[PDB]
Amino acid sequence: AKKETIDKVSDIVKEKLALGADVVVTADSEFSKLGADSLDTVEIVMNLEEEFGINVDEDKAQDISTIQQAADVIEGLLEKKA
Numbered sequence: 001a002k003k004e005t006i007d008k009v010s011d012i013v014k015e016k017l018a019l020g021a022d023v024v025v026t027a028d029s030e031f032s033k034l035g036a037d038s039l040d041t042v043e044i045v046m047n048l049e050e051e052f053g054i055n056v057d058e059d060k061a062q063d064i065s066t067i068q069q070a071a072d073v074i075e076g077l078l079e080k081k082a
């Protein structure tokens, strides 16, 4: 995934887990480290699915460990369609 796609996901996540002002997010930052809980984590994918207009199961998003990890998977879905 490019730096642009990462910024979009990071922007939404940091905002979802906090204000994003007092929180630092990186492509190497793990979702668990950010504090993303079960109630939050589900919200992260929910917003991304709506923002990116895609659909992904939580089971598949298991290989996700960092922000970019999800970014790469999402980019793949976009390429699949159209």
Ligand SMILES: *OP(=O)(O)OCC(C)(C)[C@@H](O)C(=O)NCCC(=O)NCCSC(=O)CCCCCCCCC
Binding pocket: 031, 032, 037, 038, 039, 040, 041, 042, 044, 045, 048, 056, 061, 062, 064, 065, 070, 073, 074
């Ligand atoms: O929701 P919470 O109160 O945290 O409940 C936790 C729970 C008690 C259910 C615990 O037993 C639990 O987590 N069970 C499920 C197994 C588990 O530990 N899952 C961890 C989820 S973390 C995860 O998936 C990290 C990546 C998240 C990616 C989200 C964005 C993906 C976009 C494609």
